[PDB]
């Protein structure tokens, strides 16, 4: 075959991986990975072009990103604007893309039966995109709106500010996102034809020698091979040289600098950065990984430990950060407590002391060896990935590794290279440092403004005395290298499947104190388990005060176990512990082999917990900030929040929590934990490589520990109170209106409540949702350009359900609302006119979506945990509900629309949350006339004036 330059050899895979692989290089220079998995419910492809923002023209910031939007909008094999995404939608698929500095990465998934159709529509993006003129004018708004969303986000502000304080002549300085000004307004003024410029960029850079493709389906390797060759050898090779950037964006003048910056949220952070050469080529020994592992360690003797003990910082991130071909960074980043902000010079001193300890001891092979072994285990035992993410990640790394080495390259670690370690470490020095501090205390004391985000800041040289006192960092006896990691798993046996192993979880214990659900894993056979526990207590959430105390206590506990648990996390054993509205959640995941040791430690600490005064004050203060900081979350996130507050029986607001928090004292917290712990019920799912007897053993010990140390006794059945959804009146329409004080965009969520969940009411709603899904995005966003964020779909809470739209926009919510209603009418007309073939396509897509099998253990646990915490316990739900779906008719869906959702439906139940932009006042399809809504004035008054739904009835 003359279409294929080369077929690759064996692709090194994990032993536990049952998928089959073949790499190849097409004659046009495209790198390919084909993945055959004959069990997959969804097939997938991705293509990654090794070009991005770093190559935008200097006078059209954002071109490559914009180009990336435009490729979705028609090709002239498939000129119909939304052909691609309508096809995926009717065949259970989904798609997305991103632009980074050097890559533009596109990907989809689709039902395994429609790979070729999906793939051929996709391949056209790369042959002849339309860039239609009127679609260009529309979609620049989506881009602009995407920038708008980020403008007031602290992380983007910082990301761009770093760019703006390095070499302005360096392409690292470029603004990558684009916006209406850079894409349309400034180019019109300059006489630039943006259409030509998209085409020119695509023609110059979308070349086959810069592309990798990955394709995953049911087909054999040979068939997938034919498929790829068919669709992609047509791609032109323009022989583009790969952009390289050997000059570091930070030169001499950009070093030994201090930046003091004003954030939007009340946060205090120190960012420390050193410029470093590109380390990518050393991937085999990865000295950057090695140094990050040490500098960023969190266990005893670590730099964090000390800083945290001094009461300076709570969290720390260390290690190498990507730049581009030719440069990288090494960062050490911390949060600051109020003392920490006064002690920045000391924090940095300590950073250098720790570094100097590494210098003094030299590189440690035993450490490198432990990283190597741990990576080897993680790779032997890796979870099977979802196809979409997997094709995308892999398409990205085919640019970096020989075909044969791509599955292994980002895991396996090979030769210890003490010498490269010293070369990197030797770049980590005071003469080489950039310091940034972020804090509201610089408000009014800054003299510079970043040009794209408007970020307020100041820049100063670090004085020579400071650099010198840092260069003299002596050693500090509080810094030691990590001890050997004792959590490393060593028992990997898959216990054989028991005589009466069940396919769904079985209830193997049911006492007053515990309900215990158990299933031995019958699909994955990895030495791993998931242990999930819900602990109910009425005192977790009885009142704002208490709800604050539940939270604080769990934080303080995590803070206290952190040194010990970090090791465990490195060894693939982790946990999650948080307060809920019912009392506490605890989850331990990872290799089964040492789970009981960590589990036991957690329950032991939790029941015998002694609070550190200094810790308590620090964490309380961070939580206070965390509560105020909600004001700077996105308008659409505000709308979802207020709706949850409105529709739930009991819910404390951030204002209520914040008010009640000054009253939380050390002595009341100390009294709170015993009370919290004294009476409990525990519901549990243990799922994994574990046996009935071991499960009982695990549960017994959780109990015996609580019982022993906390004297815990069971709860009454009637004390086990789940909460209700507000029941909306037939034909009611309510609006709650609030303002976001930070973002100059508005948000809205509209909720059409339907009825209690049940087989039929579930599938009516889900099918309608399916039918309107891409039309909603296509109309409200693509056609009308209301905003970058446009979502629609089912809302499920507290046993009830309904259909929701969320949108964020520069347009006022009253307007968004008429548009949604207009769209609903367009949707109705569209269902009346659609063919039976089309309708069954939708049933079929929904069906595939719901039956798609879990690919890893924890996705299967999440399904069961869903059924448990919601107390519906319907483990065979997908089968029942899909059989039922298959029965539904167009006429049915219409009658349901007509009784529940249409504007003059007898049972319409509508609530809208309107969140006004910072700055706003207190052709198209025909919008219908709407009633005067009842304006909600007070959430409590609203909840009280209304009935409450029942709770849903359970199954097993």
């Amino acid at each position: 075959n003359p279409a294929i330059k080369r077929i690759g050899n064996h692709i090194t895979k994990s032993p536990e991986d049952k998928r089959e692989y073949r790499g190849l290089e097409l004659a046009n220079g495209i790198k390919v990975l084909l993945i055959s998995d004959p069990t997959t419910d969804k097939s997938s492809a991705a293509l990654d072009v090794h070009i991005g923002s770093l190559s935008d023209p200097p006078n059209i910031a954002g071109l490559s990103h914009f180009l990336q939007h435009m490729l979705f909008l028609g090709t002239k094999k498939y000129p119909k604007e939304n052909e691609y995404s309508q096809f995926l939608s009717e065949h259970a698929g989904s798609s997305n893309a991103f632009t980074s500095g050097e890559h533009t990465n596109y990907y989809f998934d689709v039902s395994h039966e429609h790979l070729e159709g999906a793939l051929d529509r996709f391949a056209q993006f790369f042959l002849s995109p339309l860039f239609d003129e009127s679609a260009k004018d529309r979609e620049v708004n989506a881009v602009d709106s995407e920038h708008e969303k980020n403008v007031m986000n602290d992380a983007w502000r910082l990301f761009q500010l770093e760019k703006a304080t390095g070499n302005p002549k360096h392409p690292f300085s470029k603004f990558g996102t684009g916006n209406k000004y850079t894409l349309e307004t400034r180019p019109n003024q300059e006489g630039i034809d943006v259409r030509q410029e998209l085409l020119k960029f695509h023609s110059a850079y979308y070349s086959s020698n810069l592309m990798a493709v990955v394709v995953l389906g049911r087909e054999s390797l040979d068939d997938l091979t034919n498929l790829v060759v068919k669709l992609f050898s047509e791609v032109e090779n323009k022989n583009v040289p790969l952009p390289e950037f050997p000059e570091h964006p930070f030169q001499e003048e950009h070093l030994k600098q201090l930046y003091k910056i004003v954030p939007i949220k009340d946060i205090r952070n120190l960012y420390v950065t050193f410029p470093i050469p590109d380390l990518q080529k050393y991937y085999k020994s990865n000295p950057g990984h090695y140094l990050g592992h040490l500098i960023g360690h969190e266990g005893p003797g670590s730099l964090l430990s000390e800083l945290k003990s001094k009461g300076w910082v709570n969290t720390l991130v260390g290690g190498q950060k990507e730049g581009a071909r030719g440069f990288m960074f090494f960062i050490i980043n911390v949060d600051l407590t109020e003392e920490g902000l006064l002690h920045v010079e000391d924090i940095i001193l300590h950073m250098f002391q720790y570094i100097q300890k590494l210098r003094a001891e030299g590189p440690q092979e035993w450490v490198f060896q432990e990283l190597k072994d741990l990576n080897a285990v993680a790779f032997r035992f890796k979870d099977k990935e979802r196809p979409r993410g997997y094709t995308s990640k892999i398409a990205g790394i085919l640019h970096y590794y020989p075909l044969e080495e791509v599955l292994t390259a980002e895991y396996l670690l090979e030769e210890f290279r003490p010498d490269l370690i010293e070369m990197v470490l030797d770049k980590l020095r005071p003469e080489n440092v950039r310091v940034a501090i972020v804090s509201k205390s610089f408000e009014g004391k800054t003299d510079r403004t970043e040009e794209w985000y408007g970020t307020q800041y100041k820049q100063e040289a670090i004085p020579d005395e400071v650099i010198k006192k840092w260069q003299n960092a002596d050693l500090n006896g509080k810094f030691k290298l990590p001890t050997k990691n004792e959590f490393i798993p060593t028992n990997f046996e898959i216990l054989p499947l028991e005589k009466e192993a069940t396919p769904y979880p079985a209830l193997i214990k049911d006492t007053a104190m515990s309900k215990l659900w158990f299933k031995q894993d019958d699909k994955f056979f990895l030495p791993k388990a998931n242990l999930n526990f819900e602990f109910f207590s009425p005192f977790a959430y009885v009142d704002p005060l208490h709800s604050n105390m539940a939270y604080l206590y769990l934080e303080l506990l995590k803070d206290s176990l952190n040194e010990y648990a970090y090791a465990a996390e490195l060894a693939g054993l982790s946990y999650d512990l948080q307060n809920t509205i019912y009392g506490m959640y605890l989850s331990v995941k990872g290799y089964n082999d040492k789970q009981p040791i960590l589990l036991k430690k957690i329950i032991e600490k939790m029941a015998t917990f002694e609070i550190d005064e200094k810790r308590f004050e620090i964490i309380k203060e961070a939580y206070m900030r965390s509560l105020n900081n909600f004001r700077a979350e996105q308008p659409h996130q505000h709308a979802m929040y207020y709706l949850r507050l409105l529709m739930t029986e009991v819910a404390w607001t951030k204002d209520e929590l914040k008010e009640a928090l000054d009253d939380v004292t050390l002595p009341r917290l100390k009294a709170f934990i015993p009370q919290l712990l004294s009476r409990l019920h525990i519901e549990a799912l243990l799922h994994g490589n574990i046996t009935k007897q071991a499960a009982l053993g695990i549960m017994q010990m959780v109990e015996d520990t609580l019982i022993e140390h906390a004297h815990t006794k069971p709860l009454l059945p009637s004390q086990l109170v789940r909460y209700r959804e507000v029941q909306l009146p037939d034909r009611g329409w309510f609006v709650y209106q609030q303002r976001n004080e930070v973002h100059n965009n508005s948000g809205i969520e509209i909720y059409y409540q339907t009825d209690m969940q049940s087989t039929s009411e579930n599938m009516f709603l889900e099918l309608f949702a399916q039918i309107i899904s891409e039309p909603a995005f296509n109309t409200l966003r693509t056609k009308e350009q209301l905003g970058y964020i446009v979502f629609s779909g089912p809302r499920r809470a507290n046993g009830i359900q309904g259909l929701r739209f969320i949108i964020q926009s520069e347009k006022p919510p009253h307007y968004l609302e008429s548009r949604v209603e207009a769209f609903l009418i367009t949707m109705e007309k569209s269902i009346e006119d659609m063919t039976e073939e089309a309708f069954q396509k939708h049933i079929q897509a929904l069906a595939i979506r719901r039956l798609d099998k879990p690919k890893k253990l924890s996705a299967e646990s999440a399904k069961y945990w869903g059924e448990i915490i919601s107390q519906q316990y319907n483990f065979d739900r997908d089968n029942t509900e899909v059989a039922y779906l298959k029965t539904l008719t167009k006429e049915d869906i219409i009658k349901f629309y007509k009784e529940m959702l249409a504007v003059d439906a007898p049972r319409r139940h509508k609530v809208s949350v309107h969140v006004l932009a910072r700055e706003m006042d207190s052709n198209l399809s025909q919008a219908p006339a709407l009633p005067q809504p009842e304006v909600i004035q007070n959430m409590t008054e609203f909840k009280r004036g209304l009935p409450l739904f029942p709770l849903v009835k359970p199954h097993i």
């Binding site: 997305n96 990558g176 960023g296 969190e298 290690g319 190498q320 995005f777």
Partner: peptide
């Protein structure tokens, strides 16, 4: 511990 993409949809 050991150590920015613009998307088409969220």
């Amino acid at each position: 511990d050991a150590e920015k993409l613009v998307f088409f949809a969220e």
